[PDB]
From a paper:
Here we describe the discovery and characterisation of endo-acting glycoside hydrolases expressed by mucin-degrading members of the HGM that are able to cleave the O-glycan chains of a range of different animal and human mucins. All of the GH16 enzymes comprise a β-jellyroll fold, characteristic of the family, consisting of two β-sheets composed of β-strands that form the core fold, which were superimposable with other GH16 structures previously published. Overall these data reveal that the nine GH16 enzymes analysed are endo acting β1,4-galactosidases that display a preference for polyLacNAc structures found in mucins and other similar glycans such as KS.
The apo structures of [name], BACCAC_02680E143Q, BACCAC_03717 and Amuc_0724 were obtained to 2.0, 2.1, 2.1 and 2.7 Å, respectively. The −1 subsite in BACCAC_02680E143Q is composed of a number of aromatics, which are also a common feature of the GH16 structures available. This enzyme possesses four fingers (numbers 1, 3, 5 and 6) that extend towards the cleft, with fingers 1 and 3 sandwiching the negative subsites and fingers 5 and 6 sandwiching the positive subsites. Finger 3 contains the sequence motif for GH16 subfamily 3, which consists of three tryptophans interspaced by other residues. For example, [name] residues W131 and W138 are platforms for the −1 and −2 sugars, respectively.
Author numbering: 34 to 274
């Protein structure tokens, strides 16, 4: 029961322009190097893949990323098949979801199906953010501390999150990794916002290094590792029975 699928096999060199929008600059770790990215120069559809490129163009770091203009309800599972072409030190690829039309971050939550950093190069991270976890200023969220530590992100894997009123279930390659559960506190506490807003799909390969003179989580950029790409074979949203 498929609510949405993109196989990136349209007769087009860019992703569906009604569904996918190019990521824009913001002064944060994942967004700082969308600055000066000229249209689709780091984003194409080729050979059935969405290809998101991270590179240094003439001394400027440039990220590759899109986000979905549509969001999805509860009672659904998001599956994204992707690999990195290459491990890149300073590389910061991600597959994740933001609420559409929620209050200021992180009051509507955030779901990360996949982030990779050089600091733990044989795992990925699956993470949840809420106002109840992060408060005003926090940015760590709650992450799967028992994440697979013997994992090769440069092979194809299916990253998934099943979102219901009761819980988020995380999977890698169809295998459950962890659960973030509704505690059913007063709504006032903002502990489980995940069914009050549609959630979109964000696919990016970003570059880390320092943000305002402070080392980001993905850490130092090694220019000799660039360029790198994330290849997304498909995204689908399944409606649960
Ligand atoms: Ca494909």
């Amino acid at each position: 029961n498929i609510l949405f699928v993109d196989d990136f096999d349209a007769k087009c060199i860019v992703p569906d322009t009604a569904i996918w929008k190019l990521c824009t600059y913001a002064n944060n770790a994942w967004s700082q190097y969308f600055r000066g990215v000229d249209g689709y120069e780091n984003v194409k559809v080729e050979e059935g893949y969405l290809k998101l490129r991270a590179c240094k163009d003439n001394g400027t770091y440039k990220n590759g990323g899109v986000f979905s203009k549509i969001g999805f309800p509860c009672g659904t599972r998001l599956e994204v098949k992707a690999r990195l072409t290459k491990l890149v030190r300073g590389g910061f690829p991600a597959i994740w979801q933001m609420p559409i039309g929620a209050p200021e971050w992180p009051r509507g939550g955030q779901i990360d199906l996949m982030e990779w950093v050089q600091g733990s190069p044989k795992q990925i991270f699956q993470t949840v953010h809420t106002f109840y976890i992060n408060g005003e200023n926090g940015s760590a969220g709650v992450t799967n501390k028992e994440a697979d530590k013997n994992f090769d992100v440069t092979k194809d894997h299916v990253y998934a999150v099943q979102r219901t009123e009761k819980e988020l279930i995380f999977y890698v390659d169809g295998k459950e990794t962890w659960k973030y559960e509704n505690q059913h506190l007063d709504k006032e506490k903002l502990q489980y916002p995940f069914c009050e807003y549609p959630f979109n799909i964000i696919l990016n390969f970003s570059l880390g290094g320092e943000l305002n003179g402070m080392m980001t989580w993905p850490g130092e950029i090694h220019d000799e590792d660039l360029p790198g790409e994330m290849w997304v074979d498909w995204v689908r949203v399944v409606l649960l029975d």
